From a paper:
Molybdenum ions are covalently bound to molybdenum pterin (MPT) to produce molybdenum cofactor (Moco), a compound essential for the catalytic activity of molybdenum enzymes, which is involved in a variety of biological functions. MPT synthase is a heterotetrameric enzyme composed of two small and two large subunits encoded by moaD and moaE. MPT synthase catalyzes the conversion of precursor Z (cPMP) into MPT via sulfur transfer of MoaD thiocarboxylate.
The α/β structure exhibited a hammerhead fold containing an additional four-stranded antiparallel β-sheet domain. The anion pocket of substrate precursor Z (cPMP) bound to EcMoaE was found to consist of His103, Arg104, and Arg39, which corresponded to His109, Arg110, and Arg45 of DrMoaE, respectively. In the dimer interaction interface, the two anionic binding pockets in the dotted frames were symmetrical to each other. When the corresponding Arg110 in D. radiodurans was mutated to alanine, the gel filtration result of DrMoaE shifted from a single peak of 34 kDa to a single peak of 17 kDa. The DrMoaE dimer disappeared, suggesting that Arg110 had an irreplaceable role in the stable dimerization formation of DrMoaE.
Numbering used by the authors:
A (entry chain A): 9 to 145
B (entry chain B): 10 to 145
């Protein structure tokens, strides 16, 4: 009830995250959104194919949320990752954290994005003109 | 590349997102501050926010320029709301888009801490302890 962790093919929405996180007792919400970038360090990309097994990815998310709470205290946590072929400027991940005060929310969001970049079992194939290749990045 | 506004109308995350997202900016970081109840152990009925709108928007644009000095290329969105705001209503929204994630996250964090100090915005929380306006 204080945590939302979902892997989905549907578009990710900040407004849905906001609808879940904001409560009168939580004066602060901090977000991160990752979207597909069109010149990736001097390379032109037209799509990225994301793969995730929802049960294993969501179990990682819920463990991430509990680690964030261990470090930063009371939180509401929103984590979603999108699957499928994603065109540029389309969101692949949304992370949102609400807390009584701003500094815990900012730190918890920061922790989650760095933690999930390491621990999330996501596999992706980028369209660089260099064939199909699936990487755990 | 920069949007800075003081308004009495509701603040919108989805409006910030519409302004920020561009194909070359793969990362966006946001902060929203909402009216908190209870606060310091007492129920808050509302917070009256008052701002010198032209002065405050100039501070916002200088803050966005300082953010770029430290973190490079950015799209920056800053809005602050004025008037009588009830619990869970947003008083400030900050959004930053950058090519990569570290500058977006740290620039957003920089902006909220910077603006907490420099914004000419005065508030009065109605927490039942009389009138008391604070630069907070």
């Amino acid at each position: 009830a204080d945590t939302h962790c979902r892997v989905t093919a549907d578009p990710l929405s900040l407004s849905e995250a906001d609808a879940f996180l904001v409560k009168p007792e939580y004066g602060a919400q901090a977000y991160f959104m990752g979207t597909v970038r069109s010149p990736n360090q001097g390379q032109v990309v037209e799509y990225i194919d994301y793969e995730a097994f929802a049960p294993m990815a969501e179990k990682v998310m819920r463990e991430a949320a509990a680690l964030a709470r261990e470090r930063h205290g009371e939180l509401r946590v929103w984590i979603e990752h999108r699957t499928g072929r994603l065109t540029p400027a389309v969101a692949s991940i949304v992370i949102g954290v609400a807390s009584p005060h701003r500094r815990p929310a900012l730190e918890a969001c920061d922790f989650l994005i760095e933690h999930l970049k390491i621990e999330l079992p996501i596999w992706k194939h980028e369209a660089d003109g260099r064939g199909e290749h699936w990487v755990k990045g």
